[model samples]
Target chain A: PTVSQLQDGLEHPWSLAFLPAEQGLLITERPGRLRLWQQDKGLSPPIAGVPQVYAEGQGGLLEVLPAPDFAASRRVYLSFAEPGEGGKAGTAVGYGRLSDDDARLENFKVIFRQQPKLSVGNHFGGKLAFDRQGYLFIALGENNQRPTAQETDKLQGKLVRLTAEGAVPPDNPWVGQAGKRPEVWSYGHRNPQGLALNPWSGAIWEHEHGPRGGDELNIPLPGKNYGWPLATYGIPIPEAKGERVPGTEQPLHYWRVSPGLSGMAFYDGQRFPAWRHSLFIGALAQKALIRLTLEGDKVVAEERLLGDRGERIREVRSGPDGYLYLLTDERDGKLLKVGASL
Target chain B: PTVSQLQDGLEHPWSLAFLPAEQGLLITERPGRLRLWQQDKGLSPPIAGVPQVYAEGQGGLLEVLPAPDFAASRRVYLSFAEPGEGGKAGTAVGYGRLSDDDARLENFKVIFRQQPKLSVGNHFGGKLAFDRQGYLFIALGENNQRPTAQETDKLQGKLVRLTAEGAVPPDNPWVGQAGKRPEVWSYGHRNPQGLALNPWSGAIWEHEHGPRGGDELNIPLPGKNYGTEQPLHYWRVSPGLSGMAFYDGQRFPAWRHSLFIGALAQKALIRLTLEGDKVVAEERLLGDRGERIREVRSGPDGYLYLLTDERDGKLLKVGAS
Candidate 1:
């Protein structure tokens, strides 16, 4: 894969996705704008027809996921905070048909919405992922409502499982559990904006926010609880001196100080054998791309890429090729690909 | 005289002025965009046809000024940093026709370009004012080119006086003086972005930035230099700094001893009073605005107008009834 700095002048890019067979990329800006980045051609005028998502604060058009059979279907999914009243809102996952020309979204509709609405903008976890079975999985954040993480009846703080049309699988853990969680695969998350499926084991992995200094990487299991507010290793925002609870699952790697964990993805690329079994997580507050090597879900080693460039790195993922791509958060922001292929 | 907040929902407003007849206010954004607020109507979509300004690092649409006969002429002036290759580009001044209904720029023409661009992003002195006799005046920042500010041949750091159409008036101090700095009506300025015509004296009052901690207010005399790059009164940027206006209306009892200065760093408003030509009392106002005020103007309606831009821009008018 080739690496390139997608030129400055774009603003606060939130996500990037390839356009099937087309040699262009779709980029979402934080201020409700979308641009298509063609290989040699620069950014095009914002793609028209994107339904306005919940645009107040951090809620706007985010994450673009191409359909598994995109080569012929030309279908894609989008995740964003939905507009609501009294500032109460939830994540909306929608699918649309993409036009072959210039790659604009067509025939779009929100197929799924996080059950209860949230009023805050801090965490909506809402990353889009599909497994080999073509089932969709969404990571919903605890929305700064710490206690909601342990609530079984709400969808605010959990990883959700659904079929292609956003239906619940009959075998889900909560299918028959009385007075317990439903459509929930895992629970207790602070803000997990990143999630990926490991092709080798088909196991799902996620990284979430800690308090002031506790960021964690986790191996999510169905029906498992990932303690958030109840038990945290991070500092309480207003200067508290202790953990929230006891007996929560220990994180694979808890950063003593939070690095503003924004997004991440697993790597199985051939370009770097050193990163062959590693998970690369992108940090926004710390502004770095971190590499965490995994030995069967256990983090063995961690390394940081890129020095301080003063840009907020929001999302990172390995491209169709082995190289990595990142979206920086700022007005006149940029889309940058790293590794080799200069 | 009346004081009221005209509009809200602006992401860091830079400047505001009346649109003839005192019916509306024209505002500019720091990121090089324009907007208008009217009494009957609220804020308008960013008016189009703005010159592509270099907006990063303190550049963008700096200030917008209305002409003396704006009601009859529909003419306005704008000053901003015109991005160019060298190091730091010069501040550009342009005059244009404003079409409210069309919401677009028409037949706009650049009247002035700061010569010898430097590489610094600070000090784009761009206040616009008209003399009693209809002469046009502009403030050219030193562009941090200190040596150029002191040179007689360069226009880098001086207050320039010219005819309405940008010609050197023959009555200027250096006019016909065999190249002794003709366009310069006054010199020794660091970066003067605030200039206004005093209501009582018709004298020109200009405010500028000083080195490290010295922002000054100056009055330009016919042909003599202001002498000190220091302000008639000076204050550090910590308290507040930016565009200033002479309070002429009678409504402000506490405001008489003050020229309102917009503060970018302090995210508030500052009031400076005069002891002769020097500023004496510097009072902080609208600290509750909680946003950077970019420019201040005294509306013809006799109210103080402020441009609050902490990124989400807004045009605010403050006046006491």
Candidate 2:
């Protein structure tokens, strides 16, 4: 892991997406704003033309992704919590052409929104990544509405597959099925906060919060319910007496207890063969990098790599340079490099 | 405050409820087991005939409550994360009658199951309370499906009012409506952890968790969406939110402004008082309580109760009795 201090002044950096030029990155803040982080500079002035974000709990400026050909096209994708009428909030994904100077948004259009504005701001699982086929995969949390995961017609709690410009893929599990929300690729997930793709298999791995215990790492399956409210191995809220039903799902592996699991990444880089191609999960409760060895779909073994060695590890990514990158989540969070400091 | 170790050995304690007798307490652990905590001593042995629980992650033994007349009838109500026929798991509420000796459950019946189960276990807002008129109220958290909170017809996130024995309440907000679930009392709740009635106004006050910074304390009003998918006071979940209780006893302030809030994220106790229904003043208390504050309650004797959720959980009672 490589660790270095970026330009010394940045706060609440919610997302990081590599810029097309290979030397810069695009990052968003918690308060519905944007900044461009060039090779060694701290941050460019606020990007103009960005829309106003709700900036509420779990809402606010979220994920930022650049289109595959950002160098030539200057197209970028951004997600944020849009303030809705009546004080509710909605998750919005939009694509825009960045100015040649890279300081403002131009010709922006909203591509997708979680239909039905919500009042609360928990579970706005907004993560965006493009597959080799240029399909955009958006991870959506089950807006804390415990039963919506079972309802096939809603798009609240599932991974969504869409065109790069944000149209639902026709081959989705329930596409063309009348009354079903076609964008939903799966169901029954509780606040899946961290999402990533396996470089080797392109499988989707998501990490989400469990109730009292049982934070989980999952391989999201199409049209499947990852059992949020319905199935949980963790204890319920401390309000009831006499144990109720114990819901169960075989997580490839879980924390056994709660570690507040966050960002997930698969190491396919050349930095360390033994570590490369392995999986590293950022843990909020444990404040470390958790490494897991996977055998097919099941996790065979695991270790707490940077055991309580840092603040809150929010994001983990395999740098284009083959090293691992970790983002600390906090008011004044830091970015840590794993493997080496180079 | 009074603190006692009820049972040293148990899985995790999910909830503690007073039986109709008020002297006996029913305690639920996450392993789908039941232990009766009696005022006479500590607890009755683990009762038999408990249902199967999906005890993984946040699904398992959930909330349990006794029927209104549990003292004589011995009937009880339970809510659990029911394993779906396929891979999904659905939240189910059941009712059973305890045997005369409180050793086994009889007439166990599954009353309701949250349709379309979720795979994650974060937001199963399962809190049960009985209104003055004897109707039952269930708080349904937005099951991590964020958009469902805005849907008018979905029941994923809601405070549903039902009949005492699991039928739909005739006067429920959606009663007699076509297509909409008639059991709904209010909708768009993210995850309501606490539900209780005001002794004087019969109002329901609840406190819920907001994603980053929106913790809320609210009273579920009829007809209007109490901001279901949305919430009232959006405090971040970092403050870790939980149960709330209004200070009604004369030992505290006379107005209803002095209320108690438990913080799961911050490990603190919060006190709030209101002008009318709106919270006008707030104060943080008991951060030094040394544990995650899970539940704050008021006893019939006018004393306030607190639950320090730690490896050594404690049930304490304060306030002038």
Candidate 3:
């Protein structure tokens, strides 16, 4: 019946990772601060050795995740807006060991960097996930460049899969193909901010963002192109003629009106037993959390949460503790624990 | 706070119109029955001399509307699937004088017939409306021929505007064009089913039904192509929409600024809260009835009335919710 704010003054907290054995929670603030939150200790000061992010418009420290074997290795991975040669930037992922004392990152090394570092400060698409098999997946935007999603060689606008050390997996769609980046897993995304490993089938489900009235949910399979810069709900690209564009994969689900999609999750938690298998999408423009009620593979209905208070919810996770956790992006951002019984 | 069945057992009721001055109502059953319903007298027998409709799959006697001056003229207009040469069929509109006895159509004359009646039994966009100025607007489908909507010379996939007597208006967009049809008001429609004249402003509002996730609402301006396709608002999934009406009734004060549309497939009444031309929000209503709503009418009595389409269809009177 009441929503409790765990912490405030987060300065646009981007993502969070729950540490094992009550080690505390890891959170990233957009302007490049990684902090730890604990049960009785409140919040720790910024941890050292985070990657140097561009920290400009729509770019900064992004997703943070602990390794699946984090209990044993204490290795942490983060996706962020990596500044590069010239005045350009792109999404990059790196890893470091969480120090035993929880004060610093040890031997942080970037594992993968997007190619030709894009020309803008926006749409870095710094979203990350580890598949069920431990292969790391990185989601990249088209760097606000319309045509990059169509180019196979550019990592921008691509879904990439790589080993923990940043090497392309041999079974990747374009591992040894000429003129194609070996890391390219799936291409043709606009600015997909949310990536999730479907707990039911271990599939990759991501959503494309920011084409007016177009927010698309797709299951990104290897090597297939999801039409971007070509077709959209707002208006199909001027070059692509007619109602239906040929040979492009349609989004399994699309909103005729955009919800400004960002964080996404398939709820598999016990706290809200009725919400299991529901897909929760965090919205930036509508300022609400969208829950798509699911039946098997179809979304049968939708419910919106917390829209009355008008907080721009940036991320949502069905946390390990079973409560739904939320990160709002405002000047005074907040981490809120939702669920009354908790 | 509920829906009451005013009548039932009408076969595939396609449309209904309230006759002015409580002069009863005109209703069309798709298998070519035009019946008048008076409150005390119940359903009248089929009014004779109605147009011969192609009563086949998805084609039959469609919309029935009384003339703007029906109290005086007693004239009625109707649209239907008109069968023609080579076993082809297309939409046709006609009118006749309703006799004082109300039993027959006197001198029924066809006003407009879709040109080059094409093949197929589906997608006959036979919806009709009269603009505030008395010009008749007839919505025709693409006749299941996809490219005809983009073709300027064809009338099958166009919104046709004409005088009450079937003559093309001199101000029509392609009036003097060498190859264009003069009756074409707007083009690029796939299969528009609902047409309404806005009560606040005299603009024409119509919706196109999509086979696969493309139901769209649009205000069709003269000669402007609505892509069936940028609708002011569109459904990502098809609701198989039927009739549309604007609600400014006192019975539903909260719905005064709403647009009411019926869904055949979703079996719901869609309410679009409009801020003038833009639909800012949407809500679905009457879905629990499990009735495929075929027509939605903002009644002259301030309430709303609906006609469902089925072998045992109903005329539902919607009270305050």
Candidate 4:
């Protein structure tokens, strides 16, 4: 694969998603700013009307996406680290109409906010995706608090599925179950940073970071508990046995030594036929992009790309143009394009 | 230095502090238990009266110390990860009277609670110390939140000084500053997990675990911002520096005026020979032990004691070869 730099000098860029009608792409910076990047015009000025964010450690402006019917609705969605009283904050999702002039957002309102605000400033898993049925999926971290991952009542450390307008679906697992958050789709996640819809299986594929090791890839099932802190390959405790616990679902794949897994995408375009069905994930600690070749849902081969950049790859997206796009996480982050042939 | 094992089978023991009157040693396990180690009787049952702890991830029972007036009042101070509403937690200090039977703590009361209780499980910075003037010094981490370390307005990522009863000392650096936490002594710390006062200089020495790299050691001056000047020494590759101690012992003549750092990732003891403000020599000791050393201290008998973090953690006694 050949890679080319698309944009440069972004400060700790977090995520990038392309816009409709050749409006280019939307990029988010970890320090509470959003920019529009275009091939011919470079990066735009900071977009106005972004929410007040707690830009600290790992918290700040996160994922951005165009609405499923963005062409008709002119709507866009964003996930950010929202601040509250007494230095507390939580991951929040907001959406509004992007004006025709691309100057500011109109009628922007936060649609969903993680319950039980926390004061810590890391592990805000703000990955967002629209499933086949149009329900939005959000991945949340455990907020660095371990026990909460196993608690059904808390929203942290869980995969949440909500309608486009942020309403809980009545059929959602645990909806009728007492004492459980109705928005929760699945629980027991440490820090899920990636979410993608598999076109083949129509499954929501997710990935997360594990402390000291145990990066995971999973097909999250409704109401299922993904064992973390209890059954993990990572070093949650100095003496933890890493045993498979009962009543918990095991990950489809995991890395023994964490690569700091982040954004992920499945190659479903025809620009690179040979790359079809391959899953791509960004790695911060590994400073590379990992490609997993799949055969009927099982990953058969693994290859690492862009290790030479020696940069923290933060986001990987399968662009509508059929090319793979990446955003590096750094003081001088970059937007890069990768293609089978350049 | 010759190393000898004093105890084994501890569950991720974090800190070991000597009990006053030479009764025994108090040890804290990350699972939120306090154990007593007597020379002859071995490990005792868990001490009762400890506050509820958030014992997940890196939060748990952390440090304990005999109060400056322990001999007279039977008072002891402890620091642990205090649980709060909404699954949040923070480093908290409590004091209580030790029973005459040495079996449990009585009349326990929280002395200080970290403000803005956070949900982070790592970087609690629960180390504790008492100065000669009887004030308590506490190390609070930034809760893995970087920006908080540079903000004096918040209690996170700061070295705080307070009266033994948890009242802010009027002479604290930010005591009169509006909007700043009165307990703050100094700020700009990442995750300082160790605090010690140099016996000879009366200087407060501290050490912290850094991310990826940049682990630091410093003598934090009151009201002064640390991390400005270069650290005493730093690792480009993080060794996960933890507990520290000033050598006021005579067991090893060469170890005088030295600072002992326990390294968890490198699994070694780092000995820094200090001559005045300058670290004269840096030596890596006991790398062959292959243990995640958690704490280091000078014992009443002029020996060096060390604790390793493991499932079956061990207490080690170091003496002159």
Maximum-DockQ candidate: 3
Q: Give the per-residue lDDT of model 1 (tens digit) for A127-236.
A: 87888888888988877777777788988778888888887899998988876766888888888877888878897777888776678877788887777766677765
Chain B TM-score by candidate, in order shown: 0.89, 0.87, 0.97, 0.96
Residues B1-321 of candidate 3 have per-residue lDDT tens digits of 468899999999999999888988899999998999988898999999998999988899999988888999999999999998789999988899999999999998888888889836888998889898889999999898877777899886688899878899999988988888999999888898899999898988999874333578888888877654477776654567899989988877878989889988767777787888987556557754667899999999987889998999999888665
lDDT per residue for candidate 2 within B1-321, as digits (tens), equals: 224333555456667676664666677776688878766677688888778988766677778788878777888898877776676665678889988787888978988777667636667777788888888888877778866654667767778888887888667777777778777777766777888877666788776664323556677776566553344444432356677677777655542446677767556666665656655444445533445667776656566666665555666666531
Roughly what TM-score does model 1 have, to 2 decimal places?
0.50
Number of clashes recorded per candidate: 25, 80, 0, 0
lDDT (Cα, tens digit) per residue for candidate 4, span A1-342: 679999999999998998875889999998988899998899999999877788978899998988989888989899988887777788999898988888787888999999887738877799999998899999998887777888889888989999999999999998888999999999989888899999899999999987787788999999999987677877756424464888888888877656689899999999889789899999887677878889877876555566545788899999998999999999999999998755
Runs with alpha carbons beyond 4 Å of true place in candidate 2: A237-249, A308-310, A340-342, B1-321
Tens-place lDDT per residue, model 2, A1-342, is 335655434466677777754567777777777888776665789999887788877788888888878777889898887777877776789999989888789877889988766638778888877777878888877666666655677767777888987888878888888988889877767777777888778787787787766677777777776666666656764422222234324455554356678777787877677776578887787566767777666665454555414467777777776667666777786656567333
lDDT of 1 by residue, B123-207 (tens): 7787788879998888878888777777777888788888877788989888877646788888767778688877667888887
Q: What's the TM for chain B in candidate 3?
A: 0.97
- TM-score top scorer: 3
By TM-score, the better pick of 3 and 4 is 3
**TM-score on alpha carbons, each prediction:** 0.50, 0.51, 0.57, 0.53
Looking only at chain A, give the TM-score of model 1 against the true structure.
Answer: 0.92
**Candidate 3 chain B lowest-lDDT run of ten:** B280-289
Q: Model 4, stretches more than 4 Å misplaced?
A: A236-241, B1-321
